[PDB]
Amino acid sequence: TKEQRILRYVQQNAKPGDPQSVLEAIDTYCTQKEWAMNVGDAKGQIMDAVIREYSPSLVLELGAYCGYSAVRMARLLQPGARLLTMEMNPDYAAITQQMLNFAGLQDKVTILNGASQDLIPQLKKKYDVDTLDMVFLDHWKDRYLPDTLLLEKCGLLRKGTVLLADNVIVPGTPDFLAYVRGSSSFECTHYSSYLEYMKVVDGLEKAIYQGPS
Ligand SMILES: C[S@@+](CC[C@H](N)C(=O)[O-])C[C@H]1O[C@@H](n2cnc3c(N)ncnc32)[C@H](O)[C@@H]1O
Ligand SMILES: O=[N+]([O-])c1cc(O)c(O)c([N+](=O)[O-])c1
Numbered sequence: 001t002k003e004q005r006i007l008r009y010v011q012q013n014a015k016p017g018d019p020q021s022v023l024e025a026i027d028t029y030c031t032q033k034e035w036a037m038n039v040g041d042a043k044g045q046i047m048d049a050v051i052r053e054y055s056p057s058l059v060l061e062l063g064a065y066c067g068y069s070a071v072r073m074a075r076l077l078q079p080g081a082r083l084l085t086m087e088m089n090p091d092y093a094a095i096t097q098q099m100l101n102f103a104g105l106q107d108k109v110t111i112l113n114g115a116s117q118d119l120i121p122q123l124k125k126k127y128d129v130d131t132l133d134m135v136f137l138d139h140w141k142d143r144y145l146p147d148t149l150l151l152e153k154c155g156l157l158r159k160g161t162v163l164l165a166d167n168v169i170v171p172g173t174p175d176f177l178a179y180v181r182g183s184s185s186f187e188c189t190h191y192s193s194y195l196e197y198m199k200v201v202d203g204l205e206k207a208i209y210q211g212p213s
């Protein structure tokens with residue numbers, strides 16, 4: 001499979017225990033051999049700046065795939081900080097685990113195998129999560145809004161929680177984008193960039209929870 005090839009490429013070309021080389025290996029492979037739905041370096045660079053500004057202690061990612069963004073975020077996390085990433089496809093989840101192991105960030109990241117809708121309500125109980133500092137949304141686009149509402153219902157959002165969403169332009173997340181921008185409960189900022197492995201304009205949306213009205 002493609003995911004297996006990306007992993008093999010990393011194993012044979014990246015420096016173990018070096019997150020940077022791992023990222024560069026994946027980017028090179030996808031740029032030159034096969035396109036893959038990783039956020040990429042262009043947008044990844046914006047992600048890094050946001051992570052550095054907020055220095056989150058607990059981060060939740062929706063959509064791991066092959067672990068590119070998990071490696072990207074975790075390498076910048078402070079000692080004691082945790083990253084929980086959800087992935088419903090067991091095959092992708094396996095690749096991600098191996099990717100994290102090679103990068104040497106396995107102690108910082110916890111992979112949750114399951115659909116976000118089923119896992120979100122169990123976060124407080126099974127993983128000792130109080131409130132989230134940051135959430136990275138990058139799973140199926142039609143899930144952004146329902147999961148954001150679900151996160152709020154479960155009491156996982158505090159005043160100041162940062163939601164960062166990918167693909168708000170391409171493929172697009174119409175309902176979510178309209179909701180956050182129109183809600184008094186969120187303060188939004190848009191970062192223009194480009195779709196991974198091409199000149200299509202895309203962007204990330206930062207929406208900071210202000211609490212309910
Ligand atoms: C765009 S790809 C992931 C990108 C990844 N963030 C990166 O940059 O490396 C997202 C994924 O989320 C999955 N995903 C979709 N719906 C999901 C859901 N409801 N809960 C969890 N995982 C889901 C797919 O199986 C796929 O691996
Ligand atoms: O089709 N695409 O170009 C993309 C890009 C992306 O960055 C995605 O996250 C995606 N998806 O989750 O389906 C699809």
Ligand SMILES: [Mg+2]
Nearest residue numbers: 039138166167
């Ligand atoms: Mg994406």
